[PDB]
Structures are given as structure tokens and as C-alpha cells.
Amino acid sequence: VTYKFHQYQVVGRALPTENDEHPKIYRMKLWATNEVRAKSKFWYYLRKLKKVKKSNGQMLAINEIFEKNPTKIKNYGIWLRYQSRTGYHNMYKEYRDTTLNGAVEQMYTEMASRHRVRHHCIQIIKTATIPAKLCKRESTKQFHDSKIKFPLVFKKVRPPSRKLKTTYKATRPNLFM
């Protein structure tokens, strides 16, 4: 099981000084492909919002957060802010996935596809697991059906592997739904 995006809890603080023997400890929940990049983004946010730089800061802890039950489907809501070609905007999105990691990957892909927003131009404000009744998007609500039934409209025809691939076939493919 490999996820492109991992969730990290990063804990840090400012370097103790004479004035502040025990400075305030800050924690963040961040998304990054690696713990190194998670720590980099942690320090970026700490510098931008608390006036604490990495040079005069201390890294206390970093721990990965894994989905409790990756075997079951959940609805995930993501509040984010992104930068367009002409300004910044806020955006709430909903997804359905077994893991919040998959939900975040879907979010990044959808932002790239629909708004041409690169990964570094997106800030995640909040993530949550939304009950079915509290979902706001039809895209996710339309699968909240006890008896869900539909055919496979689009299926691509291919051999099990390239071992059986052939340039020529005696007959055309036989497809039916």
C-alpha cells in the first residue's frame, strides 16, 4: 500500500531564550510526499503565521497519520484556498474514498484539471470526515443509495497482459453491456 500524499503531524517551537524559557509549542497537520517536505512546509507556515523561523526554531516531533479503517468507504470534505491567475480564492470540495490520502490525491488532481492550479499554489485549510446526510455535493450524494445499480457504459478492451497482445485479429471485438 503506497500513497503519493502522506499526512503528518509536525510539532515544533521557538528556540528557548532567557526571556522565554519554555516557548509555546505549535503543531500542524500537513500533507506532503515526504517527511522532509512536510517539515519544510511546517517551517514555512510557522514563519508566515507565528514569526518563528527555522534558523531560530526547534523541531520536536513528526509522526505519520494513517487511516484507521482503509477497508471502508468514507466521505471527505476539504476546505482549501488556492491562487488563480488573477487572485486568491477559497474552495470547499467533497470526495469519496477509503482513505483521506486518496481523497487528497483526488483533490490535487481535480484542482489541476479544472483550474490549472499547481500543487504549490494550494493550501489546505481543513479536512473532515462528513457523514452521508451532511454531504453538500451531488457528486458524492448520488452514490448514497442503498440499492445502487448501473451498467458499465465504458470499458476498454485489452488482453490480460501484453503477452497476449497481437497486431492482427481475425474478428472484430464483441462488446455488449
Binding site: K147, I148, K149, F150, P151, L152, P160, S161, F176, M177
Partner: peptide, 22 residues
């Protein structure tokens, strides 16, 4: 039409990947 649908309890065959034939 549409003799087959994806449903809860529907049995499918894995037609691609390392799990082909299952």
C-alpha cells in the same frame, strides 16, 4: 437490454493486472 449491472453482491472477474483470473 443491459443484461449485467454493477450491484452489491455482483460477482466480477478481474480481467487485468496481477490478480487476473480471480
Amino acid at each position: 437490454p443491459f443484461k449485467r449491472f454493477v450491484e452489491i453482491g455482483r460477482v466480477a472477474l478481474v480481467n487485468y493486472g496481477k490478480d487476473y483470473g480471480k
